[PDB]
Design an enzyme around this catalytic site. Structure first.
Site, PDB file in Angstrom:
ATOM      1  N   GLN A  19      43.084  47.042  36.950  1.00 36.95           N
ATOM      2  CA  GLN A  19      43.578  48.139  37.757  1.00 36.95           C
ATOM      3  C   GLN A  19      45.078  48.312  37.653  1.00 36.95           C
ATOM      4  OE1 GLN A  19      42.016  46.259  41.445  1.00 36.95           O
ATOM      5  NE2 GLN A  19      43.937  46.785  42.317  1.00 36.95           N
ATOM      6  N   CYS A  25      41.028  49.349  43.368  1.00 37.21           N
ATOM      7  CA  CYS A  25      39.906  48.430  43.372  1.00 37.21           C
ATOM      8  C   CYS A  25      38.603  49.084  43.726  1.00 37.21           C
ATOM      9  CB  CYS A  25      40.175  47.299  44.383  1.00 37.21           C
ATOM     10  SG  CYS A  25      40.515  47.907  46.101  1.00 37.21           S
ATOM     11  N   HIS A 162      39.279  44.905  49.932  1.00 38.88           N
ATOM     12  CA  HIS A 162      39.165  44.904  48.469  1.00 38.88           C
ATOM     13  C   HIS A 162      37.727  45.183  48.105  1.00 38.88           C
ATOM     14  CE1 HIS A 162      39.900  43.955  44.410  1.00 38.88           C
ATOM     15  NE2 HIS A 162      39.740  42.654  44.413  1.00 38.88           N
ATOM     16  N   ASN A 182      36.119  40.778  39.223  1.00 41.43           N
ATOM     17  CA  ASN A 182      37.313  41.414  39.777  1.00 41.43           C
ATOM     18  C   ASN A 182      37.890  42.390  38.749  1.00 41.43           C
ATOM     19  OD1 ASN A 182      39.340  41.867  41.718  1.00 41.43           O
ATOM     20  ND2 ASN A 182      40.195  39.812  41.584  1.00 41.43           N
TER      21      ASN A 182
HETATM   22  C1  LIG Z   1      42.272  47.484  46.391  1.00 35.85           C
HETATM   23  C2  LIG Z   1      42.432  46.024  46.746  1.00 35.85           C
HETATM   24  S1  LIG Z   1      43.707  45.225  45.789  1.00 35.85           S
HETATM   25  O1  LIG Z   1      43.140  44.400  44.796  1.00 35.85           O
HETATM   26  O2  LIG Z   1      44.675  46.247  45.317  1.00 35.85           O
HETATM   27  C3  LIG Z   1      44.564  44.397  47.061  1.00 35.85           C
HETATM   28  C4  LIG Z   1      45.837  44.773  47.465  1.00 35.85           C
HETATM   29  C5  LIG Z   1      46.543  44.167  48.531  1.00 35.85           C
HETATM   30  C6  LIG Z   1      45.876  43.155  49.210  1.00 35.85           C
HETATM   31  C7  LIG Z   1      44.593  42.779  48.819  1.00 35.85           C
HETATM   32  C8  LIG Z   1      43.903  43.420  47.776  1.00 35.85           C
HETATM   33  C9  LIG Z   1      42.817  48.479  47.441  1.00 35.85           C
HETATM   34  C10 LIG Z   1      44.287  48.263  47.732  1.00 35.85           C
HETATM   35  C11 LIG Z   1      44.910  49.328  48.612  1.00 35.85           C
HETATM   36  C12 LIG Z   1      46.412  49.222  48.618  1.00 35.85           C
HETATM   37  C13 LIG Z   1      47.228  50.252  48.139  1.00 35.85           C
HETATM   38  C14 LIG Z   1      48.613  50.080  48.145  1.00 35.85           C
HETATM   39  C15 LIG Z   1      49.179  48.913  48.627  1.00 35.85           C
HETATM   40  C16 LIG Z   1      48.391  47.934  49.135  1.00 35.85           C
HETATM   41  C17 LIG Z   1      47.013  48.060  49.129  1.00 35.85           C
HETATM   42  N1  LIG Z   1      41.991  48.375  48.653  1.00 35.85           N
HETATM   43  C18 LIG Z   1      41.280  49.386  49.108  1.00 35.85           C
HETATM   44  O3  LIG Z   1      41.262  50.496  48.592  1.00 35.85           O
HETATM   45  C19 LIG Z   1      40.360  49.100  50.299  1.00 35.85           C
HETATM   46  C20 LIG Z   1      38.992  48.689  49.710  1.00 35.85           C
HETATM   47  C21 LIG Z   1      37.860  48.518  50.693  1.00 35.85           C
HETATM   48  C22 LIG Z   1      36.582  48.871  50.299  1.00 35.85           C
HETATM   49  C23 LIG Z   1      35.513  48.746  51.142  1.00 35.85           C
HETATM   50  C24 LIG Z   1      35.687  48.268  52.422  1.00 35.85           C
HETATM   51  C25 LIG Z   1      36.942  47.947  52.860  1.00 35.85           C
HETATM   52  C26 LIG Z   1      38.054  48.070  51.994  1.00 35.85           C
HETATM   53  N2  LIG Z   1      40.224  50.284  51.131  1.00 35.85           N
HETATM   54  C27 LIG Z   1      41.242  50.774  51.818  1.00 35.85           C
HETATM   55  O4  LIG Z   1      42.362  50.220  51.762  1.00 35.85           O
HETATM   56  N3  LIG Z   1      41.087  51.872  52.600  1.00 35.85           N
HETATM   57  C28 LIG Z   1      39.860  52.609  52.695  1.00 35.85           C
HETATM   58  C29 LIG Z   1      39.731  53.344  53.985  1.00 35.85           C
HETATM   59  O5  LIG Z   1      40.975  54.109  54.167  1.00 35.85           O
HETATM   60  C30 LIG Z   1      42.156  53.473  54.127  1.00 35.85           C
HETATM   61  C31 LIG Z   1      42.313  52.362  53.263  1.00 35.85           C
END
Ligand SMILES: *[C@H](CS(=O)(=O)c1ccccc1)[C@H](CCc1ccccc1)NC(=O)[C@H](Cc1ccccc1)NC(=O)N1CCOCC1
Length: 215
Positions: A19, A25, A162, A182
Protein backbone atom coordinates in the site's frame (compact mmCIF):
# COMPACT_ATOMS: atom_id res chain seq x y z
CA UNK A 1 -13.68 -27.93 9.30
CA UNK A 2 -10.28 -29.46 8.49
CA UNK A 3 -7.29 -29.21 10.84
CA UNK A 4 -5.59 -26.75 8.48
CA UNK A 5 -6.09 -24.87 5.27
CA UNK A 6 -3.77 -22.58 3.31
CA UNK A 7 -5.42 -20.96 0.30
CA UNK A 8 -2.00 -19.88 -1.02
CA UNK A 9 -1.32 -23.55 -1.79
CA UNK A 10 -4.69 -23.90 -3.45
CA UNK A 11 -4.08 -21.12 -5.99
CA UNK A 12 -6.47 -18.46 -4.61
CA UNK A 13 -3.96 -15.83 -3.43
CA UNK A 14 -1.97 -13.32 -5.48
CA UNK A 15 1.47 -12.09 -4.44
CA UNK A 16 1.83 -9.70 -1.55
CA UNK A 17 1.33 -6.06 -2.41
CA UNK A 18 2.43 -2.80 -0.84
CA UNK A 19 0.00 0.00 0.00
CA UNK A 20 2.94 2.34 0.52
CA UNK A 21 2.39 5.70 2.19
CA UNK A 22 -1.40 5.62 1.88
CA UNK A 23 -4.08 4.42 4.30
CA UNK A 24 -5.62 2.12 1.70
CA UNK A 25 -5.49 -1.14 3.69
CA UNK A 26 -9.27 -1.43 3.40
CA UNK A 27 -8.96 -1.54 -0.42
CA UNK A 28 -6.28 -4.29 -0.25
CA UNK A 29 -8.49 -6.34 2.10
CA UNK A 30 -11.52 -5.97 -0.22
CA UNK A 31 -9.59 -6.73 -3.39
CA UNK A 32 -7.71 -9.71 -1.90
CA UNK A 33 -11.03 -11.24 -0.89
CA UNK A 34 -12.49 -10.70 -4.38
CA UNK A 35 -9.36 -12.16 -6.04
CA UNK A 36 -9.88 -15.31 -3.99
CA UNK A 37 -13.66 -15.56 -4.53
CA UNK A 38 -13.24 -15.12 -8.26
CA UNK A 39 -10.60 -17.86 -8.44
CA UNK A 40 -12.53 -20.28 -6.21
CA UNK A 41 -15.55 -19.78 -8.53
CA UNK A 42 -13.49 -21.40 -11.29
CA UNK A 43 -11.78 -18.48 -13.02
CA UNK A 44 -8.02 -18.07 -13.44
CA UNK A 45 -6.33 -16.16 -10.61
CA UNK A 46 -5.96 -12.53 -11.55
CA UNK A 47 -4.65 -9.50 -9.66
CA UNK A 48 -7.35 -6.86 -9.30
CA UNK A 49 -7.22 -3.12 -8.80
CA UNK A 50 -6.98 -1.49 -5.38
CA UNK A 51 -6.42 1.80 -7.22
CA UNK A 52 -9.96 1.58 -8.60
CA UNK A 53 -11.24 1.68 -5.04
CA UNK A 54 -8.73 4.25 -3.77
CA UNK A 55 -9.56 6.67 -6.56
CA UNK A 56 -13.21 5.92 -7.47
CA UNK A 57 -15.03 4.66 -4.35
CA UNK A 58 -16.88 7.74 -3.19
CA UNK A 59 -18.11 6.21 0.09
CA UNK A 60 -14.59 5.58 1.40
CA UNK A 61 -11.85 8.14 1.76
CA UNK A 62 -8.99 6.99 -0.44
CA UNK A 63 -5.73 7.16 1.48
CA UNK A 64 -7.64 8.61 4.44
CA UNK A 65 -9.28 5.27 5.24
CA UNK A 66 -12.28 3.15 4.53
CA UNK A 67 -14.31 0.06 5.34
CA UNK A 68 -14.50 -3.19 3.38
CA UNK A 69 -18.28 -3.09 3.91
CA UNK A 70 -18.44 0.26 2.12
CA UNK A 71 -16.14 -0.91 -0.68
CA UNK A 72 -18.27 -3.95 -1.43
CA UNK A 73 -21.36 -1.72 -1.45
CA UNK A 74 -19.71 0.78 -3.83
CA UNK A 75 -18.62 -1.98 -6.23
CA UNK A 76 -22.11 -3.50 -6.43
CA UNK A 77 -24.27 -0.40 -6.24
CA UNK A 78 -22.03 2.15 -8.05
CA UNK A 79 -19.74 0.13 -10.35
CA UNK A 80 -22.13 -2.45 -11.73
CA UNK A 81 -20.50 -5.23 -9.67
CA UNK A 82 -17.32 -4.88 -11.73
CA UNK A 83 -13.74 -5.00 -10.53
CA UNK A 84 -10.96 -3.91 -12.90
CA UNK A 85 -7.65 -5.72 -13.25
CA UNK A 86 -4.52 -4.37 -11.66
CA UNK A 87 -3.01 -4.35 -15.18
CA UNK A 88 -5.83 -1.98 -16.35
CA UNK A 89 -5.65 0.30 -13.36
CA UNK A 90 -2.32 0.03 -11.57
CA UNK A 91 -1.53 1.18 -8.08
CA UNK A 92 -0.01 4.65 -8.03
CA UNK A 93 -0.91 5.89 -4.55
CA UNK A 94 2.14 4.33 -2.78
CA UNK A 95 3.85 7.74 -2.46
CA UNK A 96 0.57 9.32 -1.36
CA UNK A 97 -0.51 10.71 -4.76
CA UNK A 98 -4.28 10.59 -5.21
CA UNK A 99 -5.19 11.27 -8.81
CA UNK A 100 -8.73 11.63 -10.03
CA UNK A 101 -10.79 8.60 -10.81
CA UNK A 102 -10.06 7.28 -14.36
CA UNK A 103 -13.03 5.09 -15.33
CA UNK A 104 -13.06 4.29 -19.06
CA UNK A 105 -12.55 0.99 -21.03
CA UNK A 106 -10.79 -0.71 -18.14
CA UNK A 107 -10.42 -4.45 -18.41
CA UNK A 108 -13.04 -6.11 -16.25
CA UNK A 109 -11.31 -8.76 -14.15
CA UNK A 110 -14.09 -9.97 -11.90
CA UNK A 111 -17.69 -9.29 -10.92
CA UNK A 112 -19.50 -9.63 -7.62
CA UNK A 113 -23.18 -9.53 -6.77
CA UNK A 114 -23.30 -8.99 -3.03
CA UNK A 115 -21.30 -9.50 0.15
CA UNK A 116 -21.94 -11.31 3.41
CA UNK A 117 -20.98 -10.82 7.05
CA UNK A 118 -19.69 -13.67 9.15
CA UNK A 119 -20.39 -14.12 12.86
CA UNK A 120 -17.91 -13.15 15.56
CA UNK A 121 -17.03 -16.83 16.02
CA UNK A 122 -13.60 -18.23 15.23
CA UNK A 123 -14.89 -21.74 14.66
CA UNK A 124 -17.55 -20.51 12.20
CA UNK A 125 -14.99 -18.27 10.50
CA UNK A 126 -12.60 -21.23 10.09
CA UNK A 127 -15.30 -23.46 8.65
CA UNK A 128 -16.43 -20.78 6.19
CA UNK A 129 -12.85 -19.99 5.19
CA UNK A 130 -12.07 -23.66 4.58
CA UNK A 131 -15.11 -24.07 2.34
CA UNK A 132 -15.19 -20.75 0.53
CA UNK A 133 -11.77 -19.07 0.34
CA UNK A 134 -9.91 -16.07 1.77
CA UNK A 135 -11.96 -13.64 3.90
CA UNK A 136 -11.71 -9.91 4.45
CA UNK A 137 -11.11 -9.16 8.12
CA UNK A 138 -10.45 -6.17 10.35
CA UNK A 139 -7.87 -6.10 13.14
CA UNK A 140 -6.30 -3.83 15.65
CA UNK A 141 -2.91 -3.34 13.97
CA UNK A 142 -1.10 -1.92 17.01
CA UNK A 143 0.90 -5.12 17.53
CA UNK A 144 1.55 -5.50 13.78
CA UNK A 145 3.77 -2.44 13.83
CA UNK A 146 6.57 -4.28 15.73
CA UNK A 147 5.99 -7.77 14.35
CA UNK A 148 9.15 -9.61 13.39
CA UNK A 149 7.96 -13.22 12.94
CA UNK A 150 6.36 -16.07 14.71
CA UNK A 151 2.86 -16.53 16.12
CA UNK A 152 1.33 -13.62 18.13
CA UNK A 153 -0.37 -14.73 21.36
CA UNK A 154 -0.69 -11.39 23.21
CA UNK A 155 -1.85 -9.11 20.40
CA UNK A 156 -3.23 -5.72 21.47
CA UNK A 157 -6.96 -6.11 21.03
CA UNK A 158 -8.51 -2.70 21.67
CA UNK A 159 -9.79 -1.00 18.50
CA UNK A 160 -10.19 -2.08 14.87
CA UNK A 161 -8.06 0.09 12.60
CA UNK A 162 -6.76 -2.08 9.73
CA UNK A 163 -8.14 -4.35 7.03
CA UNK A 164 -6.26 -7.50 5.99
CA UNK A 165 -6.94 -10.86 4.34
CA UNK A 166 -7.43 -14.15 6.19
CA UNK A 167 -5.96 -16.92 3.96
CA UNK A 168 -5.65 -19.98 6.21
CA UNK A 169 -5.11 -21.54 9.60
CA UNK A 170 -3.33 -24.50 11.18
CA UNK A 171 -4.63 -26.19 14.31
CA UNK A 172 -1.77 -28.73 14.28
CA UNK A 173 0.49 -26.29 16.08
CA UNK A 174 1.29 -25.19 19.63
CA UNK A 175 -0.59 -22.87 19.50
CA UNK A 176 -3.07 -22.99 16.62
CA UNK A 177 -2.74 -20.03 14.28
CA UNK A 178 -4.39 -17.97 11.59
CA UNK A 179 -2.47 -16.99 8.45
CA UNK A 180 -3.03 -13.37 7.41
CA UNK A 181 -1.90 -11.55 4.25
CA UNK A 182 -0.91 -7.94 4.97
CA UNK A 183 -0.37 -5.13 2.43
CA UNK A 184 2.95 -3.77 3.73
CA UNK A 185 5.10 -5.51 1.04
CA UNK A 186 6.73 -8.89 1.02
CA UNK A 187 9.56 -7.46 3.17
CA UNK A 188 7.33 -7.19 6.26
CA UNK A 189 6.64 -10.07 8.59
CA UNK A 190 6.81 -13.60 7.20
CA UNK A 191 7.12 -12.78 3.48
CA UNK A 192 4.32 -10.24 3.92
CA UNK A 193 2.19 -12.45 6.16
CA UNK A 194 1.55 -12.65 9.89
CA UNK A 195 0.48 -15.55 12.05
CA UNK A 196 -1.67 -14.86 15.13
CA UNK A 197 -3.00 -17.44 17.59
CA UNK A 198 -6.41 -18.93 16.70
CA UNK A 199 -8.97 -19.30 19.46
CA UNK A 200 -8.36 -16.23 21.67
CA UNK A 201 -9.72 -13.50 19.37
CA UNK A 202 -6.24 -12.11 18.79
CA UNK A 203 -6.21 -8.54 17.56
CA UNK A 204 -10.05 -8.53 17.48
CA UNK A 205 -9.83 -10.64 14.30
CA UNK A 206 -13.32 -12.10 14.71
CA UNK A 207 -15.15 -8.79 14.80
CA UNK A 208 -15.66 -7.67 11.17
CA UNK A 209 -15.20 -10.66 8.86
CA UNK A 210 -16.82 -10.47 5.40
CA UNK A 211 -16.72 -11.87 1.91
CA UNK A 212 -17.90 -10.88 -1.54
CA UNK A 213 -20.40 -13.14 -3.32
CA UNK A 214 -19.54 -14.13 -6.91
CA UNK A 215 -22.54 -15.24 -9.04
C1 LIG B 1 -5.26 1.15 6.91
C2 LIG B 1 -4.52 0.61 8.11
S1 LIG B 1 -2.77 0.93 8.03
O1 LIG B 1 -2.06 -0.24 7.71
O2 LIG B 1 -2.52 2.10 7.15
C3 LIG B 1 -2.50 1.56 9.64
C4 LIG B 1 -2.20 2.89 9.87
C5 LIG B 1 -2.03 3.45 11.16
C6 LIG B 1 -2.22 2.59 12.23
C7 LIG B 1 -2.54 1.25 12.01
C8 LIG B 1 -2.72 0.73 10.72
C9 LIG B 1 -6.11 2.41 7.17
C10 LIG B 1 -5.29 3.56 7.71
C11 LIG B 1 -6.04 4.87 7.80
C12 LIG B 1 -5.10 6.02 8.06
C13 LIG B 1 -4.95 7.07 7.15
C14 LIG B 1 -4.04 8.09 7.43
C15 LIG B 1 -3.30 8.07 8.61
C16 LIG B 1 -3.48 7.08 9.51
C17 LIG B 1 -4.36 6.04 9.25
N1 LIG B 1 -7.22 2.05 8.06
C18 LIG B 1 -8.48 2.14 7.69
O3 LIG B 1 -8.84 2.56 6.60
C19 LIG B 1 -9.52 1.61 8.68
C20 LIG B 1 -9.76 0.13 8.31
C21 LIG B 1 -10.88 -0.58 9.03
C22 LIG B 1 -11.61 -1.54 8.35
C23 LIG B 1 -12.64 -2.21 8.94
C24 LIG B 1 -12.98 -1.94 10.25
C25 LIG B 1 -12.31 -0.98 10.94
C26 LIG B 1 -11.24 -0.28 10.34
N2 LIG B 1 -10.76 2.36 8.56
C27 LIG B 1 -10.84 3.63 8.91
O4 LIG B 1 -9.83 4.22 9.36
N3 LIG B 1 -12.01 4.31 8.81
C28 LIG B 1 -13.21 3.75 8.27
C29 LIG B 1 -14.44 4.41 8.80
O5 LIG B 1 -14.26 5.85 8.61
C30 LIG B 1 -13.17 6.46 9.13
C31 LIG B 1 -11.95 5.75 9.17
Amino acid sequence: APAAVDWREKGAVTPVKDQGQCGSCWAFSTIGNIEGQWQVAGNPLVSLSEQMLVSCDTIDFGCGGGLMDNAFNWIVNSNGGNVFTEASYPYVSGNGEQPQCQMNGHEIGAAITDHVDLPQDEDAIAAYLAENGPLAIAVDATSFMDYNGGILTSCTSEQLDHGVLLVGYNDASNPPYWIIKNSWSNMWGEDGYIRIEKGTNQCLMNQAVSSAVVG
